[PDB]
Amino acid sequence: STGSATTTPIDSLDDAYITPVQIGTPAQTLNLDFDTGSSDLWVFSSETTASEVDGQTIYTPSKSTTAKLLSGATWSISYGDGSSSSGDVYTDTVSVGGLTVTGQAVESAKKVSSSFTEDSTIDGLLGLAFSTLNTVSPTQQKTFFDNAKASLDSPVFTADLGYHAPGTYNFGFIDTTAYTGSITYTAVSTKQGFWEWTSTGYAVGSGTFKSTSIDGIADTGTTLLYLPATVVSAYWAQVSGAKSSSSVGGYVFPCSATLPSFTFGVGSARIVIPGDYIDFGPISTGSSSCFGGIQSSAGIGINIFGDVALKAAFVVFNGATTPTLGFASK
């Protein structure tokens, strides 16, 4: 089997991407944030504290003839950005882009933190990291990909995120028309439950390439590119007037600037992030100070190749017995 679904930016800055997901019978379609950095499929629901729902579409398991309460199961998650959610668990039928899993754990939110409530466009998350990170207790549950894997034509999914435009998540096949040149594959460590890999280095603008190992995660659920302070300093030094602002919470730059590109290495290959992808707009409405899309990972504890990086590539998440990641230009 295969699946193919369009993923759409939630706003004009590509702050996140939503993909329609069919849950239950009859289908209830929710727009979920596909997140390769976590492993829970959770949704706003009829059980969510009413004051914490503000415009989201909810899953109502009582209206699904295939929903079954997973007795005694609870979940609770906290994300790298400080947000959180928790609740109980159903199993139900879940389909993405024509690909159907029966008995998928659908984690129903009883509580969500303010950042989720305040984002009317995201109805929940669909985790695509390794199932070892899944938070369901006392019996850990499998991700959608993990459940689908054996049925797929090939045990892979691909992320093709757009810049200020829709893109595609495919399951079970590689669309050879969706990228240019070749896909370069690189080793993955699953020891932390992530799609963790090591970039071979970077360049700023038309500058020379610096060969240096950068261990980090491919994370579709994180907006920006988080890299070591040395790398980030070298980037922003090429933008006149850019500075790190503690009050704002990262590097800012004059909105009148033209940003240089940023290149990252995948083996001997190179992915170029155009400068415009690094612009996240005014820090507040009307400001002439703009927020940077490359920020320091210092104090996160891990480097994160988030959407800023991934949207510059066609990315293969290969879930073979030994997982690997593939990157191609597009």
From Swiss-Prot:
It comes from the Eukaryota. It catalyses: Hydrolysis of proteins with specificity similar to that of pepsin A, prefers hydrophobic residues at P1 and P1', but does not cleave 14-Ala-|-Leu-15 in the B chain of insulin or Z-Glu-Tyr. Clots milk. Residues 17-328 form the Peptidase A1 domain. Disulfide bonds join 255-290. Keywords: Aspartyl protease, Disulfide bond, Hydrolase, Protease, Signal, Zymogen. The active site is at 35, 199. GO terms for molecular function: aspartic-type endopeptidase activity. The keyword Hydrolase applies. The keyword Cytoplasm does not apply. Its EC number is 3.4.23.22. It is an enzyme of class 3 (hydrolase). GO terms for biological process: proteolysis. Belongs to the peptidase A1 family. This is Endothiapepsin. It comes from Cryphonectria parasitica. The chain holds residues 90 to 419 of 419 of the full protein.
